[PDB]
Amino acid sequence: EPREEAGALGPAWDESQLRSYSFPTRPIPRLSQSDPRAEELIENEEPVVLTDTNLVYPALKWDLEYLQENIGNGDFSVYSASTHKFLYYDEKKMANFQNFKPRSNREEMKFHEFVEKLQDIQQRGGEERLYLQQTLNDTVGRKIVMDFLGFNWNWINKQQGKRGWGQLTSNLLLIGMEGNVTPAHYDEQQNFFAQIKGYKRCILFPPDQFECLYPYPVHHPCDRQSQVDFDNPDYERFPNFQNVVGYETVVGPGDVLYIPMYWWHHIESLLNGGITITVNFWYKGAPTPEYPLKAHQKVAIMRNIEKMLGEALGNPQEVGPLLNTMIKGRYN
Amino acid sequence: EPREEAGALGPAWDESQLRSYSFPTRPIPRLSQSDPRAEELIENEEPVVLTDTNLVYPALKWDLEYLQENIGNGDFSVYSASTHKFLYYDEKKMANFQNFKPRSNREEMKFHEFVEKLQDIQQRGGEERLYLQQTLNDTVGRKIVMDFLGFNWNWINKQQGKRGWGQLTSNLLLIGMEGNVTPAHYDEQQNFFAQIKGYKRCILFPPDQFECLYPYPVHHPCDRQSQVDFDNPDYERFPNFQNVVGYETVVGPGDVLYIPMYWWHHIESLLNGGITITVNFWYKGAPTPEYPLKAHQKVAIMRNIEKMLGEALGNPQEVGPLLNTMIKGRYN
Amino acid sequence: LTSYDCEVNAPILLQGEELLRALD
Amino acid sequence: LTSYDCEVNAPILLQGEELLRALD
Ligand SMILES: O=C(O)CNC(=O)C(=O)O
Ligand SMILES: O=C(O)CNC(=O)C(=O)O
Ligand SMILES: [Fe+2]
Ligand SMILES: [Fe+2]
Structure with a gap:
């Protein structure tokens, strides 16, 4: 049941904002960072939504105006699509699969250009969709640097240490339009997924559901992504998708979802929920004994x-x- | 067409002595050792029957009486079966496949005991079948030692040298009853197969027919052997066996068949042809570049x-x- | 055989641990 | 991956090259 926003501001979202799919799900636990059960879940590589880490507290004020004003003049990767689905693909593997034709295209632009593009679509009632996905780097400006330094490193550094993880490899900034979907895939790094603006529905599947999710061949550009079209599942090609069972939750500003390494995840920005902003924290996994x-x-x-x-x-x-x-x- | 034995002793064998199978075959070339075409075939890892190597010339006089008298008091592995098929199995792998029940059993005995057993079956009109399969070793007696030293080492040592092969690992002595079959399999060594007594029909298949021959799993005792029952092929389980095409020949005393490493081979002692004797020469293959x-x-x-x-x-x-x-x- | 890489939905300018230390 | 063993339809007393040399 959708949570109530503090101050009687009503439900943060409602059912009609969620897309409809063919499989059942159970809730991911929402817990306090101080709750022993949360630590148990992370230790066991099971998902949990943490509601009070203050991991990206300083980023909670971020919006397009503030970011345009402060994030620098570096390039941002922006994906453009004619569908709500932003299937990830690895450009380096495209040569070996000449017949793969990506439904989305990457364009590099300045932040203000991204913002302008978003504005032009809105005004012209266009159906085009954009999804900015860019690793945070040294070109960000002073205020963003201040914000970033104000992240709760104390808490996340202890997590990294407690779980034996390797290094933080990057922080991906994700800014999407309402309705945008990142189709089901798994990543080979540990992830603390920090929601900043808007709401995203996250559906996760454990690694033991590999047989139900049918990832592309490793050398295909869509390596690690599911071949199943969640909107029109082909049960003849993928019969065990009829057996898939997800763990789901909706995260909002302030929430951090732990997405354990190898866990499948499907992420969607709520329909009619406005733009979303997320910053992830990707860590290499511990050593193979x-x-x-x-x-x-x-x-x-x-x-x-x-x-x-x-x-x-x-x-x-x-x-x-x-x-x-x-x-x-x-x-x- | 069956060859004519020198001295007008008539056909060495006839069609009625060959078992009937579901696939076509083409002949393996029979050539002189001095024929350049023979060298070309061996160099290219293709089968050839050599008719004049004199590889085991001294063994051509071998028969059960001479061997009983001279081969020593060492143990010989003798397989016993209720069927004509002596499917090879690796006893060391049996623990991992508790449900595999071998159709043949190995018994260790003295040569004279093997001979006696053969006699008892003949006399009692029994249906039991025996197949002695034993590596030649130091327990053989003086005359056998003399015979073995008289093999054409000059010719085979040059072959070994010319092809870059590794060492001779062993010489298997095979003594079978008429009608005995060694079902299709491949070996990971190079083989010069030297026929001594009686006639054996050899059907070979190139390594590129792997998809048609369905070898057992590597960890199964029948690793390297075909799962297809040549006498009653199950096309539902093994549909590409309908596409198999063999290379066949019948070898007799004095003939040497080169069976190249990885080539499938099915070997049968002619029906009503009496006992057969063969000695093989197994060499490790050349190095993987x-x-x-x-x-x-x-x-x-x-x-x-x-x-x-x-x-x-x-x-x-x-x-x-x-x-x-x-x-x-x-x-x- | 059990060993693993670290590939994610993003390509491989300082970032991650390097960005943080440089800043601090 | 292309490397290979030397297994045949027989188990692994001198034999082969060893038998021959001992005899000669
Ligand atoms: O938020 C999204 O749309 C996609 N994010 C991820 O897949 C991730 O952080 O690992
Ligand atoms: O002669 C037989 O029956 C079996 N021989 C072989 O399989 C062989 O020498 O490699
Ligand atoms: Fe991901
Ligand atoms: Fe063999």
Whole structure:
């Protein structure tokens, strides 16, 4: 049930703002950072929404005007799409899959250009959609630097230390239009996902649902993303998607969602909820040291077999036929 | 067409002595050792029957009486079966496949005990079948030692040297009853197969017919053997067996068949042809150093993936499910 | 075989740990 | 990955190259 905003400002959102899908879900726990149960969940690599970390407290005042004024003159990657779905793709892998035609295009622009573009669409009632996705770097201006330094490093540094994680590799700034969707995928880093403006519905699936989510081949540009179109699932090609069960939550300003490494996640900015802003914190996982093997360890194994086969065969497109030759009439 | 024995002793064998199968074949060339074409075939890892190597000339006089009298008091492995098919199995892998029940059993006995057993079956009109399969070692007696030293080492040592092969690992002595069959399999060593007594029909298939022959899983005891029952092929489980095409020949005393490493081979002692005797020469292949990859190199790759997965998963029975999880809805 | 990389939905200017230290 | 073993339809007393040299 949608939470009530403090001061009787009513429900933060309602059901009609959520897209409709074919599978059931259960709630991700929302807990205080001081609650032992929260620590237990993170330690066990299970998702949890933390409501009071103050992780990005200083960023809570951020909006397009403040960011335009203060984030510098560096380039920002902005994706443009004709659909609500911003399927991630790795440009470096496009050469090996000449027939992949991306539904979104990346354009590099200045922040004020992004803002102007957003304005032109609104005014001209356009259907175009934008999604800025840019790692925070040294070109940000003074006030942003001050804000960033005011993040709760004390709390997150202890988390990093407590879980044996590796280094912070980056902080991705995500600014999306209402209705934008990042289709289901998994990332190979640990993630504290800090919501700043607007609301995003996050649907997560544990690594043991690999068989239901059908990620692209490792050498395909959409490596790590699900092949299933959540809006029109093809059960003939992906029969186990009929067995998928998600963990879901809606995060708003001040909330931090822990998205454990290898956990699938689908993220959508609420319909009619205005623009959203998020900053993530990506950390490399702990070191690979016992049986029985965890699901995510089997996923790592599968990725490695795919990688080695591609290298040994000298052409990634030969991977499938060899794998098929290996299993038919022998293991299937 | 069956060859004519010198001295007008008539056809060495006839069609009625060959078992009937579902696939076509083409002949393996029969050539003189001095024929450049023979060298070309061996160099290219293609089968050839050599008719005049004199490789085991001194063994041509061998028969059960002479061997019983001279081969020593060492133990011989003798397989016993209720069927004509002597499917090879690796006893060390039986623990991991508790449900595999071998159709043949190994018994260790003295040569004279083997001979006596053969006699008892004949006399009692029994249906039991025996197949002695024993590596030649230091317990053989003086005359056998003399015979062995009289093999054409000059010719085979040059072959070994010319092809860059590794060491001779062993010489297997095979003594079978008429009608005995060694079902289709491939070996990971180079083989000069020297026929001594009786006739054996050899059907070979190139490594690129892997998809048609369906070898057992690597960790199964029947690793390297085909799962297809040539006498009653199950096309539902093994549909590409409908596409298999063999290379065949019948070898007799004095003939040497080169069976190149990784080439599938099915070997049968002619029906009603009396006992057969063969001595093979197994050599380790040359060293693994260019694209495109050869079929046998892809076979090596597949074996390696199976091996690594078994070790990484810690249970070979987990190999299949992981492989299936890898390919369904992703590569198939 | 169990080893893993660190790929995410973003390409591989200081950032992450490097950005933070430079700033502090 | 392209590397290979030397397994055949027989188990792994001198034999092969060792038998021959001992004899000669
Ligand atoms: O917020 C989004 O739309 C996408 N974010 C992620 O997938 C992530 O942070 O790992
Ligand atoms: O002769 C037989 O029956 C079996 N021989 C082989 O499979 C071989 O020598 O490699
Ligand atoms: Fe992600
Ligand atoms: Fe063999």
